[PDB]
RNA sequence: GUAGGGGAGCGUUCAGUCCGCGGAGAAGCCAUACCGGAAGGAGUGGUGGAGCCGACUGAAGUGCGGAUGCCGGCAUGAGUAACGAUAAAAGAAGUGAGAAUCUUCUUCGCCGUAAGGACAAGGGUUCCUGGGGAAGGGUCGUCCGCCCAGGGAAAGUCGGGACCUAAGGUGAGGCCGAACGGCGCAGCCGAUGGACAGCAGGUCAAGAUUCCUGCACCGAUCAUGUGGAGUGAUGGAGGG
RNA sequence: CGAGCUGGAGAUACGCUUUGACUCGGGGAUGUCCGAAUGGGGAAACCCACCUCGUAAGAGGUAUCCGCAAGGAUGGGAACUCAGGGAACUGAAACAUCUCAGUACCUGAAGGAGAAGAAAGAGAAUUCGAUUCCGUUAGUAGCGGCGAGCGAACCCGGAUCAGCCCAAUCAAGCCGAAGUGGCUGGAAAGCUACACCUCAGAAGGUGAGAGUCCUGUAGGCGAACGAGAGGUCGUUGUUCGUGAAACGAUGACUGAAUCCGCGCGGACCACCGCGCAAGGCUAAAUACUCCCAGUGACCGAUAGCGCAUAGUACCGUGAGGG
């Protein structure tokens, strides 16, 4: 969960055969259809006093630029 | 026991007005185990003495005091 | 189970009324009210008379005959009467005290 | 407070007989402790106890009636008095 | 005439309508040799003791011999198998409506590293007294661990707590995780262990290192004197 | 309210009550110990403390998370609501995409409702004008091992009807009309003869069947003081299953314009047309039924709730079952 609008949650992961040729070949048909769960990192940041917490990575982007309520 | 001659009263006097009633009560129990309870009705009346006593003793509390 | 709530644990008479029976045997008979069970809807009139047995035996004497004693009823006794026999009631106002409303019905006298 | 605690008097031979040795017994309330207990008779009967010894007891009746039944639950204490004994007159019941 | 299709109807509960009946006796139940082509329907009588038939129309939880169907009652096996260790039992006396079985006396026999005695766990008043005698007791009970009432259980020193720690449990801060949550230093909980002051007797119907008699011990607060100046942690060590 | 009461209780004794008991309607005051449980511990209902006030009794305080502080949160709710997570039996007469189904279940948050809501929209008339719900369109359009099967929306009719803000009467209760004689019967309310009331012939009771005997009913009164962005990769939502797949949505990487500007219109281009995201609130119509009242071609003791009351007895270490 990274501290600047919390992130996890995820879904599902698909994985055909008979793929790839004529437009559309002759088709693809599926095999997997099963579940999944994306996720994200951590460093040190704070605002108000002391405080390490979870930073987003596309977060820590959003910091070293400009202080988006949070700070360094 | 009910009107303005029972709240008249000094402090230390509910106090003591409600213990008289207690060594009663516990020689009326003591009569009970014995065997000599000719008048159970003072039982009843005599709880109901203490219970308007503490009730009363809530009621001056509060005001004044507001 | 239910009792007497089909009135409304309320009478039409006191323990002290005198009541004409109406309905059953001792039909007519009067007499002093001496028992009102409002709730049980009972009334201990000089009317019904029963012979009640006593079984007693440690019970003050084994001697435990026969005794004289009434048998209490419902609503089967028109409470009130003064022309001679049963009537309602429905002229209400205040005697000498105002806080009491009286009862009465084609005259005016309970 | 003083008068209640002391809830009734041991009845029974053996209390009775305790009674003649300036020995007195009674059914106090459960929760009341030994120094609290020590407390109200030394006060309402006005005598010094000398020592004091006391302990819990069950219930369970029921006679007709498949009424389960139910406890009761008391506290005896017993206390001995110094050479100046005797409790009111309500020794000799 | 089987599966099956088609037709006409009988019966049950509820409903709307109409005609009624009923404590000089309704429903239900019971008996019957009467009626209808069948499902079925009526008469009479007997029981019952407060509700109900007929006709039309409507609606259904509407018709049972079966499902090793469900619930309940009762049969058969049958006065049969058994009455739960092959450690025996006998007589006398007693009690009582009643006695192989209850009490008492004298014998007999079985255990005796137990089939005796003391805890712990666990059970919960089963203990003692006085009563009882439905059912429980594999028979019978006058008796009982059953039923009713009353009583009985006593601690500064014995176990536990107000002390200690083990495994383990938990655990501010802290470390992780869709959630719920999972881990975790100190600390805290946690006896099966450490620590710590009382013995000898007496005796209720029923308690006893608890009550009582005798003579001890432990700690705490104060007092009176000795004494005359230190006392010694949340940390050190020894030691347990 | 106006004479009885002393709970069920079928039970005696003591008593209480017109200086108005009892009961009913509305407030207060006391409310041991446990439980969010909250001083600390704990094998719920028990152990063990410290601090303040105090003559002892006794009273008050001592949990963490928010914030200056006032003040808020922990926990419990039958079903209903949204959210995070999410089966399989089953269908496909086998099975694997698909179906069952985002169902069941777990978890979170909340309320009497919630949710959603004020067009970067629907959409093809340059019509519409927030949302939810109901009918309908329509088993149409479409999706689909194009199989089993799944299945919209716009228009129209209807319930209700709001848009606002920021950032630069009902419970307590009282009053209430009018039948008498004979007969059958244990008992009259039935039968019979004359009688009345009706704004009341709904209903229960009373020895049998009740307008006129009781309680009531129609009708009326009634309370001190009580409530009402775009992109690539991965995926997915809806009729959306990789299809020509648009659009929303977002885990990873990237990353713009600022009104001769941005997004949409089912790849994509131009033209025509609809609309201003990246801030927040927002009643009503809708849902459910622990509880309350009324009613019924609902049941009447093997029925009806499991119970004419019991979640008891009994069973189980327990969940649970009964
Ligand atoms: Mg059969
Ligand atoms: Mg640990
Ligand atoms: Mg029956
Ligand atoms: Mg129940």
Same mark, same amino acid.
């Given at each position: ?10 879904? =599902? ?16 048909? =599926? ?12 460093? =040190? ?25 949070? =700070?360094? | ?13 509910? #106090? ?17 185990? #014995? ?6 009705? $003072?039982? $009843? ?12 003793? #809530?009621?001056? #509390? ?5 | /189970? ?5 009135? *409304? ?28 069970? /409002? ?9 019904? *008379? &029963?012979?009640?047995? *006593? &079984?007693? /035996?440690?019970?003050? *004497? /084994? ?32 005697? &000498? ?14 | ?5 002391? %809830? ?61 039944? %139910? ?13 100046? %004994? ?6 000799? %019941?």
């Amino acid at each position: 969960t990274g501290k600047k609008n919390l992130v996890v949650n995820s879904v =599902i992961r698909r994985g055909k055969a008979r793929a790839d040729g004529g437009v559309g070949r002759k088709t693809t048909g =599926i095999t997997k259809r099963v579940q999944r769960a994306n996720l994200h990192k951590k460093a =040190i940041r704070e605002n108000g006093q002391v405080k390490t917490v979870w930073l987003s990575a596309n977060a820590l982007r959003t910091l070293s630029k400009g202080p988006y309520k949070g =700070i360094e | 026991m009910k009107p303005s001659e029972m709240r008249n009263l000094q402090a230390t006097d509910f #106090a003591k007005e409600i213990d008289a009633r207690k060594k009663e009560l516990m020689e009326l129990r003591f009569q009970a185990a #014995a065997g000599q309870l000719a008048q159970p009705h $003072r039982v $009843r009346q005599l709880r109901r003495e203490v219970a308007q006593l503490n009730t009363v003793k #809530a009621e001056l #509390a509060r005001k004044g005091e507001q | /189970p239910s009792a007497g709530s089909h009135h *409304n644990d309320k009478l039409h008479f006191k323990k002290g009324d005198t009541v004409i029976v109406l309905s059953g045997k001792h039909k007519g008979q009067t007499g002093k009210v001496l028992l009102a069970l /409002p709730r049980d809807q009972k009334v201990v009139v000089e009317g019904v *008379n &029963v012979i009640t047995k *006593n &079984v007693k /035996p440690s019970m003050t *004497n /084994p001697q435990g005959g026969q005794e004289q004693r009434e048998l209490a009823l419902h609503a089967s006794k028109v409470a009130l009467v003064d022309p001679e026999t049963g009537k309602a009631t429905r002229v209400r106002k205040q005697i &000498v005290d105002g806080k009491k409303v009286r009862v009465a019905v084609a005259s005016g006298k309970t | 407070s003083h008068y209640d605690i002391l %809830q009734a008097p041991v009845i029974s031979e053996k209390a009775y007989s305790a009674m003649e040795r300036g020995v007195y017994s009674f059914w106090v309330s459960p929760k009341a402790t030994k120094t609290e207990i020590k407390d109200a008779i030394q006060q309402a009967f006005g005598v010094r106890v000398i020592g004091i010894s006391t302990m819990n007891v069950p219930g369970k009746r029921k006679r007709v009636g498949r009424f389960i039944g %139910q406890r009761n639950d008391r506290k005896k204490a017993i206390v001995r008095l110094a050479e100046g %004994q005797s409790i009111e007159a309500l020794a000799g %019941q």
